[PDB]
Scaffold this active site. Structure first.
Site, mmCIF file in Angstrom:
data_model
loop_
_atom_site.group_PDB
_atom_site.id
_atom_site.type_symbol
_atom_site.label_atom_id
_atom_site.label_comp_id
_atom_site.label_asym_id
_atom_site.label_seq_id
_atom_site.Cartn_x
_atom_site.Cartn_y
_atom_site.Cartn_z
ATOM 1 C CB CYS A 120 -9.578 21.041 -3.828
ATOM 2 S SG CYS A 120 -9.606 19.856 -5.174
ATOM 3 C CB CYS A 170 -9.448 17.886 1.765
ATOM 4 S SG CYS A 170 -10.367 17.013 0.475
ATOM 5 C CG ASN A 171 -5.027 21.557 -0.281
ATOM 6 O OD1 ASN A 171 -5.281 22.205 0.740
ATOM 7 N ND2 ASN A 171 -3.796 21.185 -0.600
ATOM 8 C CE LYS A 224 -25.641 4.294 -16.148
ATOM 9 N NZ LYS A 224 -25.825 4.987 -17.452
ATOM 10 C CB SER A 249 -15.865 10.433 -7.341
ATOM 11 O OG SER A 249 -15.401 9.169 -6.913
ATOM 12 C CG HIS A 295 -14.688 19.361 -6.797
ATOM 13 N ND1 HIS A 295 -14.464 20.550 -6.138
ATOM 14 C CD2 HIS A 295 -13.680 18.533 -6.431
ATOM 15 C CE1 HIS A 295 -13.362 20.449 -5.414
ATOM 16 N NE2 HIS A 295 -12.874 19.232 -5.566
#
Ligand SMILES: *CC(=O)SCCNC(=O)CCNC(=O)[C@H](O)C(C)(C)COP(=O)(O)OP(=O)(O)OC[C@H]1O[C@@H](n2cnc3c(N)ncnc32)[C@H](O)[C@@H]1OP(=O)(O)O
Ligand SMILES: CC(C)(COP(=O)(O)OP(=O)(O)OC[C@H]1O[C@@H](n2cnc3c(N)ncnc32)[C@H](O)[C@@H]1OP(=O)(O)O)[C@@H](O)C(=O)NCCC(=O)NCCS
Ligand SMILES: CC(C)(COP(=O)(O)OP(=O)(O)OC[C@H]1O[C@@H](n2cnc3c(N)ncnc32)[C@H](O)[C@@H]1OP(=O)(O)O)[C@@H](O)C(=O)NCCC(=O)NCCS
Ligand SMILES: CC(C)(COP(=O)(O)OP(=O)(O)OC[C@H]1O[C@@H](n2cnc3c(N)ncnc32)[C@H](O)[C@@H]1OP(=O)(O)O)[C@@H](O)C(=O)NCCC(=O)NCCS
Ligand SMILES: [Cl-]
Ligand SMILES: [Cl-]
Ligand SMILES: [Cl-]
Ligand SMILES: [Cl-]
Ligand SMILES: [N+]
Ligand SMILES: [N+]
Ligand SMILES: [N+]
Ligand SMILES: [N+]
Ligand SMILES: [N+]
Ligand SMILES: [N+]
Ligand SMILES: [N+]
Ligand SMILES: [N+]
Ligand SMILES: [N+]
Ligand SMILES: [N+]
Lengths: 399, 397, 398, 394
Positions: A93, A385-386, A233, A253, A355
């Site tokens: 990422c 972050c990755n 939902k 997410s 993403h």
């Protein structure tokens, strides 16, 4: 310690719309998205020619079936000269932002004066793998490996999906299902507000998909994901990684997505030679890493490191982009760094925007530049972050 | 231009043996090979600990099914600290040398003092791909894509294998089948001579494989012993039936292996009183028309020389990577470099070509060549698919 | 009830050597094996021409990637006329015997006077399956299905391998690891003693593999019998239950390639052409019970076949009880009261091999040779099949 | 002709015929078969499913279906675990050869109650990876479409059936236009039968768990578009071809079953027979000439049944392609006024392992609607074969 080092200026940036998984941009390969963003970024710089670009660094994580040197294909597809130096970067990422760091370093060491850096990812076109075909497998069922799962989203050491390590993050830092859900709702609302106000219009280069055999052309103008917010939902959906008691969900997410972003960097000397108008100056950067399953909070190390490299205090930052790999990632790094959410992801983040993992490092930088312009700020910091335990961060000054 | 900038020292290097395709190292993944090279290189640095390494750049071309960030897996596998910054680099065959360049630059911009850089490739464990399983294919036979062919060896723009573009080189620069074969025999002979004289012993880190028979130790490169001059001269061409000049014997093979170097700043060298093996004087990348990648080193090598402030005639040994015999022949011709200064212990035609590692592999071998031949200035150049090349100038200390 | 029906005569039989999994015959497709057995059986009938064969029934189980109508490819590959009626039959491991029964019934209803029947299997060339490529599967690892496991060796209901249900047969009828192993050793020694005395020489038609642009290879023997190693056999781990398991690879049948065929003729055609009949079919019987109980389904098919033939169990001179597993033969001998001294006198599939679509015809071919070599007149062949079935056939050597 | 014991059909049934990846694609071949067997048995007053002794069921593309498709059909229908089950593959003729073998088993006295028919789920036909066991060290590899390999490709010439259909058009002189007008006529005949409720009796609707969906109609007949049909490009020979997707049979899912009993079992249980099997005939010729193999099997069946061709009230000539019906009508001298009176597989669908039984179920309905007595069904199969059967409606 960048005050002693030669200056690097951002003279433009651009991104594609972010498409949903198997969605609006799924017919395009990663280099076609990358070419699109590079070409769009160069077209904004008055007095610079695409033939002036000397070197390209471009992030790409799931490169399987993309062909030789994704970055090279991005460059040539965007119309750059065959003399252009091209390197593909993978820091999962963080790839798109590490690409920009390497680009700036290449100017600082005097090896180039014009560099294009960014990232691209087509998660829709990530293939499946058959690993045992060369030597064979005499008997038994075999597995078709999902390249997204294997090379993008699974921690190599623990063989755990990033989503499970996000649950480890919620446990370590005390964030409930409800806190993550309400964060996700707020970041969707910010992304929809920015969309509706036209605040993504400058950074996004719309994509024209010509129709096949009589069929009408399609223009993709906006990110696909922000409109999907359904708050009722969202609060009611099942958890995605831990049955029953899980706190991480598909809506809170990041999704899987297709997209690309690119920035154009020039040296002080080239700024003077062509009398270019810089958009921003890179002040500093920092990479950091820690225990792989705690990758979620590596930005709490990279961001201070970047701010120190830049000679800037955390309190002087006008806007932060903290990449929202998961809602809990943003919540946990905000808590560890003591950054109030009113300074974070002001036009929304990856939970609402999407993403595309190899592009997101550069995508959040393009959005940050748009946030600083719209909110009349000067200093910004992006951190991402990755998987594997790392993070990268960069500090810019709007000029 | 590098002389205005902070100095970067090579304090050690190491490489795995180079295994044949589906051969002696095929049971190891690319990160296992990379970890082995990194660990071996650091063990040679008296006064440096593995926990001093701050950042890693590692080349790797065919990363499918290797898992998240191959460089990180190599670093952690070698015993480096979880704090270590890790980035995987793909510049096709130039990946392992571009990784070293990026590591040097990171020392030069002051963001690290100790950097490990190199590359790894397990071509044996490259998978096949199934596209279109997400959307489906309603009716008809479907293809399984060979990842070596797709992501390693096929020019994206023309969809031609590298070996067909090697034929382009032979046509463009006038090298016959026979000239390519005689070159290949000579470089096998040099590799075998160096093998027997023990000249690879220092650079190679042997690999111990447990048994599935008793245990096996792989200590030598697998390919050099395969030379059969008569068979080599008589084999059919590999890419163009009948009239072709490029053959499997006179081309690089498919291979497995890794190589690593340890880089340190002047300040760290002095703080820990390290004994440097070599100094990086300069580097250069260049690129041209993609199907002409075979002679991109003819651009990168003068660029690296100018960057180092060193004239071509002062170089004591060159490593011109032998993607194909015709590649070395063509670049020697274009630059006017005599073969007597080129690949003195053999090149990739004879040793093997693990594509993501070879840029670092040839640098390890170059350091050994300079010592054995009592040279001081070396230059390594390597071409890559897509039209590019990378080159590095070093000084043996 | 075969007494008022037209008589069906066996005028010849033939089989290929049985090759091991990925072994001596793995370069041949199932129809290449089947054509070989068909052609060899016809070559044995003096006075009959291949152009006289009117219809073919051929068993084949794992037919994926074999191409259209395996049986039709076997017939044409053997040189039979394009006018030949061809049908592929799948009753799992019983396919090859049911094909013969169906061929016998087709003569009995007057629709043919000359039928070739048998079975073939190339387990080596059984493919893997990719089952969701048409509709697609958007995200997640997927399975490549082993076609042998899926279409050959797994009970559809309970999703268990045949080997696991073999364990059930051991528990149900009380046979130990050691008892199965000693049966395995005996049947291997019987297979090896028949090999050595040339008792398989007549039924086997050797296969010649032409060398590529490489020497020719002739395959003459069944490949498995030589693999007996009594010490290694008695010490190997179980193959289907780690802990208390009793079923092992050496005491189970293996995966194998091969084909077998018989040539069937009516009373009128036999006399018209003046053919010497090898044997006469006296009766047959199919039976079925609980799928996971398929192991002892021959204890129903065999008495049924005997009743259909009008012969008593004690009148039979030799039995062929097919050895899907060692414990299968033990349990069927137990239930039926048949002493091992009249069972598989030249060895069984545990030692000879188990090309599942062919074995029902292979064991009849071997039974005819057992009858000739051991001076016998009445023989019964029985074979269970996955899913709960069994088939059995009674023959009189003439 | 034959001198064999009587075999009676006491009932028949079929599923709706779904389109490729269409309304029935969620169901497996044994699920469709079980559905058809259970429905067929529920129509016989006085027979219990436990009376079924043996089953013969056609299925062509059995890859990934699991052990013995016919056994799964039988158990899925609720038949006794004692039932003997054999799967039959004669390509497109499998479903009719299955019924023949079922009849023969009654005739030799080995059963008194037999279920026979066929099933096919072309939607769920998998792709094959053929060389995984030995491996392939270098080079792109191929996934085999199981439909093409095991269903539609002549093994000798490696030619699809459509190409050999063009051979039929050339051999017997049938134009693109003649094949299109046949296709429209058969679509029209199927649409008319549908609207009149003439398939209601033979079709057993399928209830799918959702909102829940019920499949009651064949999916293909509503697709007819005469304008597009006459204008579409050929599908097997570019430019000059005559065979097209509209005038060819489609890929489909479906099953059909018939219940057979002996004379003695009919008398013991006082059953009302629907029909009587009078005779049958298998024939074969050159594989690429499989299209006109019915022109051999039909006379053979008629002779076996003791019935002259002119006495047949209705024929089912399976429409693997429009040209197949044309060529066999031309060779036998059968007027189109007596063929496929409720439409054929070009309009209805063609689940290959089931079609042989499908057309027999439909033939029984045609005879009843048209006040006919003697019917003949014929069906060709790839590889050169054909099967044919003659029934008397009672
Ligand atoms: C042993 C034996 O008996 S042989 C018989 C065994 N089965 C076969 O041989 C099947 C042969 N058929 C096939 O192999 C496929 O169905 C082929 C390849 C021929 C058709 O594939 P396709 O993709 O071309 O068909 P479609 O997806 O349905 O599209 C066709 C095209 O034409 C339009 N169309 C279909 N049916 C129509 C009818 N009745 N009327 C008017 N128009 C029809 C349809 O809308 C499509 O048009 P598009 O707009 O271009 O999509
Ligand atoms: C979580 C993941 C498996 C998604 O699974 P998924 O359930 O198939 O995702 P979907 O898009 O189908 O969404 C599921 C449901 O939530 C709904 N939904 C999605 N976003 C929503 C939103 N903002 N508001 C309300 N509903 C939403 C969808 O409509 C769908 O509803 P449905 O069940 O009625 O169809 C996948 O996206 C993932 O792994 N993301 C993590 C990516 C990642 O790890 N990146 C790197 C970080 S380091
Ligand atoms: C050329 C290539 C296709 C190999 O093809 P191949 O047919 O598998 O060649 P093989 O290794 O199997 O060997 C072929 C024959 O040559 C013989 N051979 C191999 N090396 C030999 C040598 N040095 N001397 C004499 N004979 C040799 C072998 O014994 C073999 O003999 P055989 O035919 O009897 O088996 C593959 O190695 C390749 O693509 N090389 C180029 C890779 C590349 O592009 N790298 C990146 C560059 S940019
Ligand atoms: C049981 C089965 C999984 C075998 O698996 P497997 O372990 O891979 O079989 P292998 O032959 O490769 O391995 C057997 C091992 O025991 C040895 N072995 C095999 N047969 C032996 C024998 N007769 N004597 C001594 N040793 C023997 C082998 O040498 C090998 O030893 P190794 O450990 O050194 O390799 C498979 O053959 C099977 O499923 N059989 C059942 C057949 C069936 O189901 N038929 C139809 C049912 S109705
Ligand atoms: Cl990392
Ligand atoms: Cl390049
Ligand atoms: Cl059964
Ligand atoms: Cl046929
Ligand atoms: N824009
Ligand atoms: N989301
Ligand atoms: N050390
Ligand atoms: N060494
Ligand atoms: N070579
Ligand atoms: N023989
Ligand atoms: N065995
Ligand atoms: N009933
Ligand atoms: N019905
Ligand atoms: N059709």
């Amino acid at each position: 310690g960048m005050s002693s080092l030669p200056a690097v200026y951002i003279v433009s940036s651009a991104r594609t719309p972010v498409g949903s998984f198997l969605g609006s941009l799924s017919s395009l390969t990663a280099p076609q998205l990358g070419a699109h963003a590079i070409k769009a970024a160069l077209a904004k710089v008055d007095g610079l020619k695409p033939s002036d670009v000397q070197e390209v660094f471009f992030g790409n994580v799931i490169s399987a079936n993309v062909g030789q040197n994704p970055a090279r294909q991005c460059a040539l597809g965007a119309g750059l000269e065959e003399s252009t130096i091209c390197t593909t970067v993978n820091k999962v990422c963080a790839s798109g932002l590490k690409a920009i760091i390497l680009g700036a370093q290449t100017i600082m060491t005097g090896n180039a004066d014009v560099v294009v850096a960014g990232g691209t990812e087509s998660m829709s076109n990530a293939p499946h793998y058959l690993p045992n075909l060369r030597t064979g497998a005499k008997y038994g069922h075999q597995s078709l490996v999902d390249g997204i799962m294997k090379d993008g989203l699974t921690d190599a050491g623990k063989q755990e999906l990033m989503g499970l390590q996000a649950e480890e993050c919620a446990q370590d830092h005390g964030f409930s299902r409800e806190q993550q859900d309400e964060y996700a709702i707020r970041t969707y609302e910010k992304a929809q507000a920015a969309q509706k106000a036209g605040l993504f219009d400058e950074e996004i280069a719309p994509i024209q998909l010509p129709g096949f055999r009589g069929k009408p052309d399609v223009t993709v103008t906006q990110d696909e994901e922000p409109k999907n917010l359904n708050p009722e939902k969202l609060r009611a959906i099942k958890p995605a990684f831990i049955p029953g008691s899980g706190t991480v969900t598909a809506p809170n997410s990041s999704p899987l997505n297709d997209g690309a972003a690119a920035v154009v960097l020039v040296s002080e000397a080239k700024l003077k030679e062509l009398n270019l108008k810089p958009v921003a100056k890179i002040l500093g950067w920092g990479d950091a890493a820690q225990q792989p399953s705690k990758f979620t909070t590596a930005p709490a190390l990279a961001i201070p490191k970047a701010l120190k490299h830049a000679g800037v205090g955390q309190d002087a930052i006008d806007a932060f982009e903290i990449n929202e790999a998961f809602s809990v990632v943003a919540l946990a790094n905000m808590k560890l760094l003591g950054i109030p959410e009113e300074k974070v992801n002001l036009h929304g983040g990856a939970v609402a925007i999407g993403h595309p993992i190899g592009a997101s490092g550069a995508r959040i930088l393009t959005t940050l530049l748009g946030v600083l312009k719209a909110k009349k700020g000067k200093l910004g910091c992006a951190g991402i972050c990755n998987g594997g335990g790392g993070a990268s961060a960069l500090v810019v000054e709007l000029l």
